[PDB]
Protein: La-related protein 1
Amino acid sequence: QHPSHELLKENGFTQHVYHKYRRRCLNERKRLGIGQSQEMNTLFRFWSFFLRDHFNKKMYEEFKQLALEDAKEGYRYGLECLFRYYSYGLEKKFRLDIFKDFQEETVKDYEAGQLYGLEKFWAFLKYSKAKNLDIDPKLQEYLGKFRR
Structure:
């Protein structure tokens, strides 16, 4: 019934439903402020899941853009949703360009004093042939400090 639900259903995504829904969410974030819109939070979660099966560059880029913006103000749900999209999405369908973004956002997250991104990056890499790809050498040191 709520757009998030019917847009995620099988064969239930329509451009028309989605676009009104999106603007409503962005309007509410503008109206109420960063971190204060629960509707915004639902959009982050929608993007997180939907992009796994139905990638769209434009949607993906906004998702990332808004996530980083919110996180800079200390509101992290968006970025958390982003790291789950990277970690879970890449294990399902790997994409080189997205993997490079995952490395980029993980290093920044780590250098900002957080471990959420690094753990998600390790959870994916540990079990993937992606570990044999060219990894940011700084990220590789950060992953070294992950011994148990």
